[PDB]
Design a protein around this ligand. Structure first.
Ligand SMILES: *[C@@H]1O[C@H](CO)[C@@H](O)[C@H](O)[C@H]1NC(C)=O
Ligand SMILES: *[C@@H]1O[C@H](CO)[C@@H](O)[C@H](O)[C@H]1NC(C)=O
Lengths: 31, 36
């Protein structure tokens, strides 16, 4: 699955993304 | 590791929960019921 982490649109529009139990070398900065 | 089925990990690890119980146990051996 894919989850989106947001501080709330009333604070910022930046976002982080969690790819659940996926090895981070096969996803397609901060990784 | 199946077809559409996944298992999510718990937020507290087992190390964290053992830390919590050792803090409770050191509170009671040493202060009685005053820390609660
Ligand atoms: C939400 O927005 C209102 C007005 O724009 C502001 O007063 C409030 O503090 C905001 N909430 C947060 C959690 O930033
Ligand atoms: C992802 O794959 C690399 C290449 O084999 C491996 O070194 C790494 O340990 C893997 N990720 C995890 C969390 O084990």
């Amino acid at each position: 699955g894919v989850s989106v982490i947001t501080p709330g649109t009333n604070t910022s529009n930046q976002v982080a993304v969690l790819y659940q139990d996926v090895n981070c070398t096969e996803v397609p900065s901060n990784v | 590791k199946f077809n559409g089925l996944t298992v999510l990990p718990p937020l507290l690890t087992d190390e964290m929960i053992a830390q919590y119980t050792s803090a409770l146990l050191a509170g009671t051996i040493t202060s009685g019921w005053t820390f609660g």
